[PDB]
Structure formats: C-alpha cells, structure tokens
Symmetry: D3
Subunit: 143 residues, 6 copies
C-alpha cells in the first residue's frame, strides 16, 4: 500500500463527508508523507448545510459550501500549521480559484483522481509556478 494510495484513499473517504449532495469532493494536504490537514465539500462550521436545510442557490448552485481544497487550506490557517512546500490529493482537479489559493499557499504538487475541464489559466499558473499535477486512481480496499 503506497502513500499515493493511502493519501488518495483518504480523499475519497473524506469526500464522503461532503455536506451538500450537489458535489462530493475531498482533499488531503500532505507534508513529508504526513497528513497535516483535510477538507471536503461543506459550508462554514456551526452553520446550516445544504444537507439539513437544502441548498443556497444563486442563479445556479448551492454557494453554501467552501471547496474542499480551500477548506484544507483554511484548516492550516485556523490551526496555525504551515502549508508551504506541501503536496495535495484531491478527488477532483481544483477549480481556477482554488488552484490560485493552493499555489499561493505554497502547495507544490496536485494529485487528482478525476477532472472535468482543467482551466487553461490553471495550467498556465501551474507552469509559471513550476507545480506538477498528476492523475492517480483510487486504490480498491478491504474491510
């Protein structure tokens, strides 16, 4: 059982905690192969959730949640734990907004399981910032 799997497996698990059916996504922040922070698709803590009270639409989607990736980053900021020089495992490739946050934060590698459309600017930023992104299936597992 490799770290990539151990990590990519944790993402899929955490993504199940998404508090808004519109999207199940999980993210894990690793440093020295050590999980430091995690996140899934959910809104502010101690706040209603698209699950209990239904979505919070605004011409389109339940804007109620904070993206998993972002949530992971916020966990570092709230818990005061450095994210610079880390890598990340995400169920889906980050949207353009998160991609900028992750990079700004100092994340040096994006490991996704799947991805609809990777924003071209994402790719540009990643290139300029010299950050690699790699697909990596979710390992099938035991009891």
């Amino acid at each position: 059982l490799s770290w990539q799997d151990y990590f990519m497996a944790n993402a899929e698990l955490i993504s199940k905690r998404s508090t808004c059916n519109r999207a199940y996504v999980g993210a894990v922040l690793v440093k020295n192969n050590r999980i430091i922070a995690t996140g899934y698709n959910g809104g502010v803590a101690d706040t209603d959730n698209c699950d209990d009270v239904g979505h919070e639409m605004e011409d389109g989607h339940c804007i109620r949640t904070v993206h998993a990736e972002m949530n992971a980053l916020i966990q570092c900021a709230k818990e005061g734990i450095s994210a610079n020089n880390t890598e990340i495992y995400v169920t889906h490739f980050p949207c353009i907004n998160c991609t900028k946050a992750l990079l700004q934060a100092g994340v040096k590698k994006i490991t996704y399981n799947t991805a609809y459309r990777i924003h071209p600017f994402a790719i540009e930023l990643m290139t300029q910032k010299e950050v690699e992104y790699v697909q990596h299936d979710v390992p099938r597992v035991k009891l």
Copy 2:
C-alpha cells in the same frame, strides 16, 4: 492614532500594493492588537500580474488576482501562523466567498471602511457564526 485608526490605516496602506488596475483592496488580520498577516489585490506570487502583462479577463474580470481577504488568510496558512479568533480590517467589505473563508478561518470581527450591499447570506452566516461587522473610516494621516 487609535488602534482602529492604525489598522484601518494599514488596510488602506497595503491596498496600494495591488497589482490589478481594476481594484485596490487591502486586508489586515489582527490578533491581540498585533498585525499578524495582510493582503492586497494580487495574483499568485512569482507569476505575471495584471500590472505587467495586462489583465486576464474572461467574462469581463481580470481573474488573475486573489482577493486581499484571502491572500491575508493564505499568508496565515503558508506560514503556519494561526488566524483563529482574529479580527480583520478591510478596505471593502468581503464578497460572499471571502466572508465564508474568513468565518471558517475563525475570525470574529470584520471592520470595513467601504461597503456595497452586504450579501444576505453574508449576514445569515455572520449572524449564525456570531461574527460582528463594523464600519470605520481611514483616519487622515500625516507623513
């Protein structure tokens, strides 16, 4: 100057470093009267800026920059410096996503200078999450 005047002064001050024609924003994160992190309208560090190579519009908005509020938080993350129970001073009241991010980060007060129409969800959130928001102008300052 008062503490508020000193902080809001910095908000207005740091916003001047913005690298995007379209907006000059500045955020100051404070904990126990100490500026711990800041932010302004800027893109990912070490990447082109709407300033040097021009904007990256897409739908009518140079999507290059990262909101000051966020950058201030990202800075916290990136440096392991905690933003739990902090207070923010911003030139303009946060958009709905920054609001979420900020509350999720653990900030308990948002002291703004300018403000359009605070999003309804913003208040629903600040209300539930018991965060207070106050207006305060930029003290006129000497040298």
Copy 3:
C-alpha cells in the same frame, strides 16, 4: 462514515504499510478530529527492514520494528507536533510499554479494534491517569 469509522479505518489502513511479516499494526493519533500523526509496524526510517533483509529475531522476535503506537508518538516528537490531550485509534490494544508512553504523552483515549488480555498494570494506569479505552470495529469500506 462516522468519525470513529474514518479513524479506525485509517488505523487498519496504515497498518498495511508495516514492513515486518509477523505483525501489521497501525496507530492514528487524533486531536480535535484531525489526524495529526500515525504509525505502523516499522523499523527506523532509512534502515533495513524485516521485509527486505529478513527479520532480526533474538529470542524469537524480529526486534527490528518499532511499535505503531510509538512511531506515531515519535513522529509527533520529531515534527514538534503536540500529542497533548489527543486520542489514539489502534488496530490492537497497546502493550504495557506503549500504554505507558501513550499516557505519559498525554493521550486521553485509546480506541482499539482487537485486544488480547489488557495487562493489569495497564488498567491500573489508565484508571489512575483517567484515560478511557474503547473497542470499535473497522467499518467495512468501499473503493
């Protein structure tokens, strides 16, 4: 999955990285619902492992590895990450020394999956040191 199910899941998960034929153990140190450190049946990092060069028996026990519980704590030490008032999830209940180490480290709960005969001194200790110990199975998990 429940929080317990997510943690005990990782315990069982990380134990798979063990490098010693004779035992597959996995420890997950948790603080405020965040996995902060982990461990599995492994020897010193960057040294031969019962896996590659075979066991180092002496009296009938490959003494190469370090107990998962410990490695999880050592990881805490090595990274300056605190283990005070944390909670541990382990595949098998701690031997008497790990029990001591864990309590001395400041963990207040030991959630195990499997358990032989908890040492009497173990209970004397957990009792005095007011640490609680709970059993919980590994949730059956998908992909």
Copy 4:
C-alpha cells in the same frame, strides 16, 4: 565549563530525580546547545512510583518506569517541540529499544557517561543511520 560538561552535568543531576532506586538515569535533549527536553527514570506522571508504593515486578524488574531517554522524547511530543536534528546526553548508553526511538525521532548524536553492554544491533542501527555515540565523563563541580 564546556557545553559537553554543562550538558553531561545536567544529566547526572536529573538522574538523581529517578523515582525508582532500581536505576538512576537521566537524559538531556540538546539542540543548538540549548536544552529542549529532559528525562530521568520514572513512571507515568500522576501515577504511583516504585519509590512510594514499591516496585512493579514482572518476572524480573520494576516495569513501572519509562526510560529517561524515552521520557525526554515524550516531553517533546507532549509539549510539541521538535527533536529532529538534536543530540543527547545520557548517564548510560540507551538500551536497544530507546536507541531505536531516539534514532526514529531524529537524534543525531548520543553522548553517554557509562555503558554496560551496548546492544550490537544498536551499533548497527547507529551505523546505518550514521549517528555517532561518544563517552564523556561527568565534570566535578562547585557549591
């Protein structure tokens, strides 16, 4: 008065705090010639001690205590202070178990005052891990 002495002297002092006559041993963890953690031969804190209630035998010795070396390491884990890249001063060379812990922790040098039998595996591990161990008498001192 050299640091080696200042440190080796502190070990002998702390070793006097051993809470079990069966063995008086002290240990000091240094980083940048700065004491970061210490330990002596004693059991879990806020627990009985071979001193007050007599030993806790198990076909041999009072298993009641945690080895000084280990205790020092635990202090880092409990207090959340990094031990990686540190050196150590111990009244006696570590047993094979502690030797593995210290190495795992990232201790880069063992300074002992005395030593019965250094486990061969200890020497092997230390070699593989490129860690030096040196004997160093205890300086005689003043008032």
Copy 5:
C-alpha cells in the same frame, strides 16, 4: 508603494504611540516582508507611564520606558515567535544596548530613518556580525 516604505511608514505610525514625550520612536520587525512584531517607546504594560504619571527620572531621563527596538524583540519572546533572520525598520538607529540585543536576536538588517550618533562599537559589532544598516526616508502619504 514599496515594502521599505510600507515598513518605514508603519514605524513612524507606531512611534506616535510612544507613552513618554521625552522620545517618540517606533520599530517594526519584518521577516519575508511580513510584519511579525512591533514596538514604540513605552514602559512595562499594565504599568504607569511617563504620560499619565510623569517621568521616572534618575539623574537624567525617564528610565520608565523600554526602547521600541527592545519592545519589539520582547514581543517575539513573549508571543513565542522567532526573530532570527529578520530585518528591522526603526525611526532612529538603535543605541548600543539595543544594537547588541537585535544582533544577538538574529536581526540581519537595520533600516533607520534618522540617527544622532551611531555608537562606534555598534558599527564594529555590526561589521563583525556582518549586518548592514541603511537610512531610508519616511514616505509621505494619503488619507
């Protein structure tokens, strides 16, 4: 608006908080262009001040205050935030005492706005310690 200005401007602002008219001086400790600590001319916190109760003379001056520079350093020590490898912006060049403290602390650059007489020993120490000091006017600013 350059960082030198942003920083030198903050010093002049903080210097206005001096709680003893005999001297208005402010200091800012920067690391990675990030303010980490600050200080002005004032006495121990939660103590009287040459402002409210008049000076505390001793054949010369109100010894009641702690120099701004020193206060900044103390803020790091009290708040537990590393000052090694930082630079500093001060309204006035440090006296010989502070100069030694700053250097000991690990401050690698002194940026002053003005300076009466720079103690020769200061210059010597700075040279031996390879630390540069630079004058830098205070930028004139807005509302």
Copy 6:
C-alpha cells in the same frame, strides 16, 4: 535535589560560561518546570569577547557583554520559544532594565541567589505587574 535547587544550580552553573572577567552571571528561564532558555554574561555570539581581546570599557565598564537575564530572553525571541508566564532563576537580582525587560516579557517570578539593593522602581514595577521575587541559595552539589 529540589526543583529550586536544580534550577538555581543551573543558574550558578551556566554563569561559569561567562566571557567577561568582571562578572559571572547566569539566568535560567523556566516554564512548567522545564528549562526553556538560559543566559550568562556574554557578548553577541560570533563577536570578540572581553575574554579573548580584552574588555571594551567606556566609562569604566566592559560594555561588550549582554546581561544574562537578557540573553536568556533574546534566546527565547531568536528561537520563537515563548517566555510568557515563565519563571526565572538568576545568580544576581536583575538591574532595573532587565527587570523591565523580564516583566514585559511576561515572567511572573524572579528567584535570585544574591542581591544588592533592589531598585525602588523595580519593586514599584514588580508590585504593579504582580511579579513575585524570592531568594534561594545554590544547593551544595556533588560531582
């Protein structure tokens, strides 16, 4: 030895590393019974010392060294290690500036061995700032 005896012992111990003929001082900063930082009569690290090149008198006092009390605090600053709510053990009671620095740093007790005439302002301060000061001799110690 008692805890006090162990700490005051170190104070007297570390003062022996002083590099200035004229005074041998030693400060031990303690938090929850752990020596966290120390100091002795020494100049800036990596600079000539009254010991090697002779004193730097000016008005009759080798102004080279930095007071032990301070160096202990500077060490705290330089290493990000907090000195809030700590306790200090010193060979000689602090001069008025160190007293200020120490209180401002957040230490709540000053356990000295020797003491000339405590400055009046020192008491005014320790009184207001509710810091207690105690005398205690250096325990006679063996090897």
